[PDB]
Design a protein around this nucleic acid. Sequence first.
DNA 1: GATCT
DNA 2: GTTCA
DNA 3: GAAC
DNA 4: GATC
Lengths: 173, 173
Amino acid sequence: HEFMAKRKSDIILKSVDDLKDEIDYKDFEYKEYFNLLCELVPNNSLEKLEINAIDEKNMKNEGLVYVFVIQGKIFKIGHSITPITKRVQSYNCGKVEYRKNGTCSTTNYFVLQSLLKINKIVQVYAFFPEQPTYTLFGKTYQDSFSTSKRAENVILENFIKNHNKKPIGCTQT
Amino acid sequence: HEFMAKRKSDIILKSVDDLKDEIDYKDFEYKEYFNLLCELVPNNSLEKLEINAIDEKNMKNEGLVYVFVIQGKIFKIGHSITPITKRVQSYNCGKVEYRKNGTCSTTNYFVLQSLLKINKIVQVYAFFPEQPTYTLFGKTYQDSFSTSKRAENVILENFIKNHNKKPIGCTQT
DNA sequence: GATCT
DNA sequence: GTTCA
DNA sequence: GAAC
DNA sequence: GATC
Ligand SMILES: [Ca+2]
Ligand SMILES: [Ca+2]
Ligand SMILES: [Ca+2]
Ligand SMILES: [Cl-]
Ligand SMILES: [Cl-]
Ligand SMILES: [Cl-]
Ligand SMILES: [Cl-]
């Protein structure tokens, strides 16, 4: 690249040659816990990633660790409390315009733009950890959320039921 | 305000009168589950919030739901898998410069700037849910993380021990 | 399509 | 103080 | 909202 | 990274 990056997220990868020093997926010690869930297909015209479902039964499963692999090289390990389709939706927020707006995460910008430029199909490996049962206010939950996030959700919903709206500082609808 | 806001996070609150239709903390239905944790003190000169620790034994406790209260009014309900100190430092990322850079969340920007402009001490009430025990790869955990986030941390730490670095797409140190 | 947490 | 997820 |  |  030719500019002085102020930060790592501004250094967009340029080609699969930038992955030359990465670790092979074969050398991933936890790989027996992972299965090939889906693939990502870069759509440069529409500045987004499309999905080809592979492990169709798991496409709506939530709470996963994922590995993005390009030509056998590990590009990224991440996670989501949502299904993979929503995590990809989130990556599709990494558009140039939104980075300019300051409304996307630097992570989503870095990854979306890198994958678009590398322009290869990305294999997505996933592991879905078992979810514990937990209690909050004499009610039991089993899901992908942290207990604090779930507690907040119940409390905010109740608040809206009781008061007809969220607090002014809770911006999201 | 006078500009055409493109989004809700750009509408910074200007004074306590902007809270006049908010719900009083005393009418909060879950108030019996919450206890005063700390106060936040706006420091406009330094464009940040300071902390007055109250519930000292809980200042390093992780996994909470919080309520920000200003002159009796509920401004916001939120949560953190970290201690309140770290959530506050995250709010301290809501600086004008960082918003211009696009490197802070719109949430942190909206809240920090609103709290600085209102310029009142904020009472922080908190509830710490009980943490369930759970198993990953035959090891037991009991913490504030979702199972997917913990699983990814465990996997990534092992990845670093094996290959001495993180994947290139994992930007954070 | 776009922002919020 | 400042960016990443 | 989590992390450096 | 979660959400609308
Ligand atoms: Ca992750
Ligand atoms: Ca009124
Ligand atoms: Ca929250
Ligand atoms: Cl969570
Ligand atoms: Cl309520
Ligand atoms: Cl600061
Ligand atoms: Cl490994």
